[PDB]
């Protein structure tokens, strides 16, 4: 594909690798090999001798399997490991600043302007969960859903078109790009090896990473009814071609809904503003919808964003925090083994009781599970173990924003 001529076919080459070269190539990769073409030990009706008709072959003994390489996390200084967080010299500051919350918020969206409420939440998704030490009771979960709905193209998609390019392992696309083989692999019923081969998909290609969707609404209720279970009891199964199919997805999601008529006329409840099937709208623990209005100040601010998109020198605004240091601080913040010993841990019962004193006028403890995880994440953001009682209050505020946002 770096040499794309016209006319002839994709001429095939035979090609070989040695031992230590083995199994560090893979499907879908572009290469830089050796050129050690060889003599290879019907229809060739030329002359024959002896004191024989060969074909062509080839081998090569060097690989640079590039365009498929990140490398995880290893200021050349001392740390837990070699280079996992050797930038202590600055990460010390990145864990002690008091305005770090906002300085982080505005550190990934300089080319964007809208609400300032998911610019403080969506770090949620990339942020940690729990990773605690327990018994064989059950799986305990770490990451959680998020949702977006909005009016037509307030940059619903540019939030996420880039986020796939932001962190690794989390490739995005839609599934309606293809068949219903988003969840399952391509259902095959002809003989190549044993007539039924379905061991993959596309949603499950995001293990320990996210693979969001667009057009969340118009998708058939097969992948979606499968999602109805696949997000919490994160183990999926099928029949009709399954060697008692036992898979596992693990990961979060981000939604991309669109209203019914394409407007937000408050004539009906939210559950009738979308008018779908219901129970799903709880396990999405935060929605944070973007609204459209008609005010010239905002739109002129947008156009004067474009004033600094193509004025080719200084076509963006100044910043305070660069991206690489941010991402590395983030990928350092997980491996901490957090701790809970705080009176909020003792006194979240009254916070939830008050939450449902407000709800004494849908309901319950799925949201609670979220709550303690949202806040344990916001304390991961403090580069600290040992849960505190303020991340509580912020998480409580986010909860109430979500529900009263849902309120009519």
């Amino acid at each position: 594909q770096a040499e794309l001529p016209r006319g002839c076919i994709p001429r095939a080459v035979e090609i070989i690798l040695r031992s230590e070269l083995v199994e560090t190539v893979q499907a879908g990769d572009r290469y830089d090999f050796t050129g050690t073409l060889i003599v290879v030990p019907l229809a060739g009706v030329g002359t024959r001798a002896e004191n024989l008709n060969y074909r062509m072959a080839f081998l090569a003994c060097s690989v640079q399997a590039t365009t498929a390489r990140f490398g995880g996390t290893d200021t050349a200084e001392d740390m837990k490991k070699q280079m996992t967080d050797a930038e202590w010299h600055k990460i010390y500051e990145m864990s002690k600043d008091r305005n770090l919350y906002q300085n982080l918020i505005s550190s990934l969206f300089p080319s964007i302007y809208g609400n300032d409420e998911v610019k403080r939440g969506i770090l949620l998704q990339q942020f940690g969960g729990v990773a605690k030490t327990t018994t064989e009771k059950t799986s305990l979960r770490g990451d959680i859903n998020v949702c977006i709905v909005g009016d037509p193209s307030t940059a619903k998609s540019q939030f996420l078109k880039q986020v796939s390019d932001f962190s690794p392992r989390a490739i995005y696309t839609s599934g309606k790009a293809s068949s219903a083989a988003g969840l399952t692999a391509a259902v095959v019923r002809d003989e190549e090896s044993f007539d039924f081969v379905i061991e993959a998909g596309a949603l499950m290609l995001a293990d320990n990473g996210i693979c969001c969707i667009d057009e969340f609404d118009k998708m058939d209720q097969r992948d979606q009814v499968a999602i109805h279970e696949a997000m919490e009891q994160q183990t999926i199964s099928i029949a009709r071609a399954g060697v008692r199919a036992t898979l596992n997805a693990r990961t979060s999601i981000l939604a991309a809904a669109n209203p019914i008529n394409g407007r937000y006329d408050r004539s009906k409840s939210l559950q009738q503003n979308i008018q779908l099937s219901a129970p799903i709208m709880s396990r999405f623990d935060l929605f944070f919808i973007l609204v459209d209005e008609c005010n010239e100040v905002v739109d002129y601010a947008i156009a004067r964003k474009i004033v600094d998109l193509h004025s080719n020198i200084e076509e963006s605004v100044e910043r305070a925090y660069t991206r690489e240091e941010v991402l590395r601080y983030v990928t350092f913040a997980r491996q901490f083994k957090p701790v809970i010993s705080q009176e909020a841990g003792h006194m979240l019962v009254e916070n939830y009781g008050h939450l449902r004193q407000r709800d004494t006028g849908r309901i319950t403890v799925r949201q609670l599970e979220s709550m303690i995880r949202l806040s344990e994440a916001m304390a991961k953001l403090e580069c600290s173990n040992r849960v505190l009682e303020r991340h509580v209050k912020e998480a409580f505020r986010l909860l109430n924003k979500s529900i009263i946002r849902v309120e009519q």
Partner: protein, 603 residues
């Protein structure tokens, strides 16, 4: 030899010198344990070998064939010397290993792993059947009519009764020993893949003592040893010599363990009768049922029962009656019920992988006429065939294609399948247990308003269903505080029974003891069923049939099984009738006290 004799001699000074478990070491007695049952599959511990003599790790890989042979000679010269009567049944032995400090995943082994000690696992696929082999070299001379004598390689010496002559020969079909044989295809699990590609595989050979043990579609654990087919026609080659790979089987462990299983401690095996005869321990069903969720005792005790039971009680010639039972909890989307069931799967002997939206119940490649075209053209009918005397896990009953939940409607009482639409009409039993915890129509849940209005599960099925439960919820602040405290404490795990045993208690209870009944008060069940049907005519009264009054006396037998009482008095019968008063009042009107006022005289 001097040193090369010491191996068997150290085994001899091992099996009566190394001790654990407070005297009377196992292999002093495990070998006679096995010669009694005529099994000939003695098994070794490696960790015990490391505890006694660590020498046997370096001496092994240079030719483990010879290690195993020098093992088996010792079992022979022990057993057939000390049980000289034994030399009738099999007269051959080999040993097994089940302790290796390593699990080598697939797609990890190369030429370095050649002809040495291994451990690996995966999944079975299609392979051959069951065939025997040869074992010995014996011919029949054809010039002079004698036999050449007894002798992957040929021998053919010139020495023989025919004046050491007769290069020619012929062969009989008898007087030579044979050997059972079977093949396998080991594929790796579709969990631990490289996340979405084709898998890799190898072939494996197992031998005569190990056959009709494996199966298509199973979990696996094998030691194995790496083979080398010595020549796939070395000659003018490809871009590769046509060479191949197998592993040879020494010892399997299965991961399901669908039999009566564990070996026995010397004293920590009668833990049954250390406590099991005390009165309060009826409710110790619940303290290790699922210490998960504050409330919900009733339904979990009920599951605990329905997991505990099994009986055939086949009378003369008629049929197979019933010993596995339908459950449900069609409650509400939110009650922690999903999670109830995973304890069953990870605790019980035998079960299956599925959610709602299975096949069309026709099944994955079920109907297929039989030829050796298309490579044997696999056959199956669903999954109940694949877990008999186990359990089926299902959820989202109300969210399946009706024409599959249709098809599953035969196993429940008849416990059998019967098919056609191929070149075959074979038939087969489906004996196992159902459990479901689905969701209804209408968002959350009606009030105590009726059931047949509340979900579209028809009449001629929910009758086949017997034991009902419903997770009804409404708002009290106190219990909300209590369970909230319980949950927050449940995430304070930082750093009266265990699960260690009731597995074994239920195996002992379901396998060995086979209780009964006696004439006690069995007229009163008639009056209670009559009250049931007469006071319940048109309200929610369709599911009032005879299997759920099979169930009562059967549950009584299950209760006395939980006691190992093996018979029973009025106590468990009144308990069953109590549970049903309870549930059948739960699924009736806001006037939740009709049968209450009608039943305080029994209570």
């Amino acid at each position: 030899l001097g040193p090369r004799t010491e191996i068997a001699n150290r085994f001899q000074s091992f099996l009566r010198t190394f001790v654990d478990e407070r005297g009377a070491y196992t292999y002093r007695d495990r070998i006679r344990r096995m010669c009694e049952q005529n099994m000939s599959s003695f098994v070794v511990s490696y960790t015990d070998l490391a505890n006694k003599e660590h020498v046997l790790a370096y001496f092994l890989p240079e030719a483990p064939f010879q290690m195993l042979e020098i093992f088996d000679k010792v079992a022979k010269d022990m057993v057939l010397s000390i049980f000289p009567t034994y030399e009738r049944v099999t007269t051959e032995i080999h040993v097994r290993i089940s302790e290796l400090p390593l699990i080598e995943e697939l797609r990890t082994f190369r030429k370095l792993h050649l002809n040495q000690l291994v451990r690996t696992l995966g999944v079975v696929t299609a392979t051959t059947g069951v065939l025997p082999q040869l074992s010995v070299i014996k011919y029949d001379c054809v010039k002079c009519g004698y036999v050449l004598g007894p002798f992957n390689t040929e021998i053919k010496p010139g020495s023989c009764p025919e004046c050491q002559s007769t290069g020619p020969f012929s062969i009989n079909m008898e007087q030579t020993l044979y050997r059972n044989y079977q093949k396998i295809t080991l594929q790796e699990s579709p969990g631990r893949i490289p996340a979405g590609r084709i898998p890799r595989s190898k072939d494996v050979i197992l031998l005569a003592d190990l056959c009709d043990q494996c199966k298509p579609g199973d979990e696996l654990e094998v030691t194995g040893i790496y083979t080398n087919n010595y020549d796939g026609s070395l000659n003018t080659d490809q871009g590769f010599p046509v060479f191949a790979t197998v592993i040879i089987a020494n010892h399997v462990v299965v991961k399901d363990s669908k039999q009566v299983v564990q070996s026995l401690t010397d004293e920590d095996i009668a833990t049954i009768q250390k406590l099991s005869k005390d009165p309060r321990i009826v409710e110790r069903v619940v303290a290790s049922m699922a210490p998960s969720i504050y409330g919900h005792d009733y339904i979990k005790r009920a599951l605990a029962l329905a997991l505990f039971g099994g009986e055939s009680k086949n009378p003369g010639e008629k049929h197979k009656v019933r010993g596995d039972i339908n459950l449900l909890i069609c409650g509400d989307p939110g009650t922690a019920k999903s999670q109830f069931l995973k304890y069953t799967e990870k605790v019980a002997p035998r079960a299956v992988f599925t959610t709602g939206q299975g096949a069309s119940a026709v099944g994955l490649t079920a109907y297929v006429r039989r030829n050796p075209v298309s490579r044997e053209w696999t056959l199956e009918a669903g999954a109940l065939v694949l877990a008999d005397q186990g359990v089926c896990l299902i959820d989202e009953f109300d969210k399946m294609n009706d024409q599959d939940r249709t098809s599953i409607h035969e196993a429940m009482e008849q416990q059998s399948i019967s098919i056609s639409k191929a070149g075959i009409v074979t038939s087969l039993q489906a004996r196992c247990t159902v459990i479901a915890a689905a969701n209804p129509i209408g968002g959350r849940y009606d009030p105590s308003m009726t059931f047949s209005e509340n979900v579209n599960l028809s009449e001629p099925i929910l009758s086949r269903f017997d034991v009902l439960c419903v997770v009804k919820d409404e708002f009290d602040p106190m219990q909300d505080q209590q369970l909230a405290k319980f949950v927050v404490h449940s995430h304070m795990k930082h750093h009266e029974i265990p699960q260690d045993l009731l597995r074994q208690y239920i195996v002992y209870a379901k396998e060995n003891i086979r209780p009964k009944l006696t004439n006690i008060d069995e007229d009163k069940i008639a009056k209670m069923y009559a009250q049931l049907r007469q006071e319940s005519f048109a309200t929610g009264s369709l599911p009032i049939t005879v299997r759920h009054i099979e169930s009562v006396i059967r549950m009584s037998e299950a209760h006395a099984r939980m006691h190992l009482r093996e018979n029973v008095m009025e106590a468990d019968v009144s308990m069953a009738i109590r549970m049903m008063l309870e549930s059948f009042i739960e699924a009736q009107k806001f006037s939740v006290m009709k049968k209450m006022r009608s039943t305080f005289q029994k209570y």
